[PDB]
Amino acid sequence: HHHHHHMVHITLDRNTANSWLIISKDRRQVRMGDTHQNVSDNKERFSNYPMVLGAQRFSSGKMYWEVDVTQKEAWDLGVCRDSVQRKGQFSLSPENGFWTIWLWQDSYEAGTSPQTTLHIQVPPCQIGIFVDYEAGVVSFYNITDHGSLIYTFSECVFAGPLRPFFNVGFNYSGGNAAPLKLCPL
Ligand SMILES: CO[C@H]1CN(Cc2cncs2)CC[C@H]1C
Numbered sequence: 001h002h003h004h005h006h007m008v009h010i011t012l013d014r015n016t017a018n019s020w021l022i023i024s025k026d027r028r029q030v031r032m033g034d035t036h037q038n039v040s041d042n043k044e045r046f047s048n049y050p051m052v053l054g055a056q057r058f059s060s061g062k063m064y065w066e067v068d069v070t071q072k073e074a075w076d077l078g079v080c081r082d083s084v085q086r087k088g089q090f091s092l093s094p095e096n097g098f099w100t101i102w103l104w105q106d107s108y109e110a111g112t113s114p115q116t117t118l119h120i121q122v123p124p125c126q127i128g129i130f131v132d133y134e135a136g137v138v139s140f141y142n143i144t145d146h147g148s149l150i151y152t153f154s155e156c157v158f159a160g161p162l163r164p165f166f167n168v169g170f171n172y173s174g175g176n177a178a179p180l181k182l183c184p185l
Pocket of ligand 1 (some may be wrong): 018020047048049050170171172
């Protein structure tokens with residue numbers, strides 16, 4: 001792909017984070033802690049899952065960023081509406097305001113309803129995410145495999161400002177402690 005020139009500098013919004021997440025000083029890395037991280041509750045925090053939003057809001061234009069997923073067993077990545085539900089249980093779907101892919105139990109899937117199987121021959125260590133607001137497109141790229149396409153959501157109905165979306169996943173196994181990291185431009 002040739003989307004690299006739309007690169008944006010994403011930082012994580014501490015206030016949106018689940019209370020078990022640990023965000024680095026530079027706001028560019030996040031991981032699951034082994035306990036509550038001693039923060040106050042607020043209406044922005046994702047309560048049920050290890051999720052956090054980027055601070056940036058997008059309502060026009062073309063945007064690109066990259067995320068490092070090295071040695072993780074489970075994660076979700078993409079974008080979401082600013083107004084997504086924060087509390088309780090919900091599915092990641094465009095109907096609920098999410099445009100995402102994930103790794104779970106050694107398979108990759110797109111967050112459609114119902115979910116779509118992805119075909120990835122080279123397990124990615126870094127994921128590229130491209131958003132074209134005007135066109136209604138969210139695309140995912142395998143940076144480890146020379147930028148090959150993973151998935152395109154088209155005919156997206158964003159219906160609001162978009163925020164970068166992250167889920168570090170649970171660590172029930174002891175094999176999923178590694179962070180998500182925003183990769184440098
Ligand atoms: C209902 O979700 C809660 C779960 N709790 C406890 C758990 C942590 N390790 C496995 S369950 C963490 C904060 C939030 C994600």
